[PDB]
Design a protein around this nucleic acid. Structure first.
Ligand SMILES: [Mg+2]
Ligand SMILES: [Mg+2]
Ligand SMILES: [Mg+2]
Ligand code: NA
Length: 343
DNA sequence: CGCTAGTCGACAT
DNA sequence: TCGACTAGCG
């Protein structure tokens, strides 16, 4: 969600991680991976061996461990079919910046070339696994999500397994997270947002419940569904405030009326909205206790799970376990490690 | 004002 | 993995 943090900044508190001393905090590790990969973009683009991002993550991990924090590193897994568009686009951008960067290396211009290399960064599962080994070497629990780390984190937080989530993506709130810590530096200073405190935001109105908030985020334009032309956070929120009807479908079919604008709503956009909603609600996560694949939320009676392939497809529990442990590479689907949490 | 969408940014010498 | 910033539209 573009500009979500600025939109709900009144619900944020400048905190320090000491607040969660002795408690358990889950981490959106790919953020630290993207931050760490920039320091060595040149060598990553050229294919030269590098492991600085590992130590970069380990600074943060050790920082948490020093304050008595019990961290759980969560990593992005398989690509979600309901997100293939964004992945494809970002991939194209990466390739383009890579090519232009190489050409700029041929020109001798190193500044611009580096400026492209830093934008052509691609976080693989191999790097992530380097981080995993490095972390497990110091007794830090690591877990690969079946798909997006967002949903997995949301589950870990809702299940009571973790009490807070360290990330740079505020849109995690739309998944149903209770507490989210943003912009955390290497010392432990960050910005916390509580779900219950969403009432602090005046411009939200009565749109602070999970359902309405989720609707707002989707309508604003997310990674699952592009917003209608001229529709952002404020206007979607306005729609949800002015809307009295619970059935969101008719509301969206009356969005032109609610905003006093001439909006044409394609029939496919409704299906896309249902898809995005069901994706936010029932995206497959991995229960670490029972060791099995479950949706983020228990299925309702108004949904047929067979049509929810875009929210991720089920696999055997053993395979899901081996992926979650990081022993199985996402793309090759072959064993790359043989870790066992039992012995 | 508020949406777009491009730009620029994240590291670290 | 993503947000901050802004010129420009309505
Ligand atoms: Mg990826
Ligand atoms: Mg994510
Ligand atoms: Mg996200
Ligand atoms: Na939008």
């Amino acid at each position: 969600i573009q500009g979500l943090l600025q939109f709900i900044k009144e619900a944020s508190e400048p905190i320090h991680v000491r607040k969660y001393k002795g408690q358990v905090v889950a981490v959106d590790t790919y953020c630290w991976l993207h931050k760490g990969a920039i320091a060595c973009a040149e060598k990553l683009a050229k294919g030269e061996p590098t492991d600085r991002y590992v130590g970069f993550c380990m600074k943060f991990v050790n920082m948490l461990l020093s304050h008595g924090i019990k961290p759980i590193l969560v990593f992005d897994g398989c690509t979600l079919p309901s997100k293939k568009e964004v992945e494809r686009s970002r991939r194209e951008r990466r390739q383009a910046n890579l090519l232009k960067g190489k050409q700029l290396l041929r020109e001798g211009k190193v500044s611009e070339a580096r400026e492209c290399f830093t934008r052509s960064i691609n976080i693989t599962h191999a790097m992530a696994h380097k981080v995993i080994k490095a972390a497990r070497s110091q007794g830090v629990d690591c877990l690969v999500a079946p798909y997006e780390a967002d949903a997995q984190l949301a589950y870990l937080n809702k299940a009571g397994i973790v009490q807070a989530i360290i990330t740079e993506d505020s849109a995690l709130l739309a998944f149903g997270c209770k507490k989210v810590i943003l912009k955390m530096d290497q010392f432990g200073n960050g910005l916390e947002i509580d779900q219950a405190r969403l009432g602090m935001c005046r411009q939200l109105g009565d749109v602070f419940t999970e359902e309405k908030f989720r609707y707002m985020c989707i309508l604003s334009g997310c990674d699952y569904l592009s917003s209608l032309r001229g529709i952002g956070l404020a206007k979607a929120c306005k729609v949800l405030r002015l809307a009295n009807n619970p059935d969101i479908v008719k509301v969206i079919k009356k969005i032109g009326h609610y905003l006093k604008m001439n909006i044409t709503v394609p029939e496919d956009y409704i299906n896309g909205f249902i898809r995005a909603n069901n994706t936010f609600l029932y995206q497959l996560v991995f229960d670490p206790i029972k060791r099995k694949l479950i949706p983020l939320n228990a299925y309702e009676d108004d949904v047929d799970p067979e049509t929810l392939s875009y929210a991720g497809q089920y696999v055997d529990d053993s395979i899901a376990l081996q992926i979650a442990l990081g022993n199985k590479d996402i793309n090759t689907f072959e064993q790359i490690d043989d870790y066992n949490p039992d012995t």
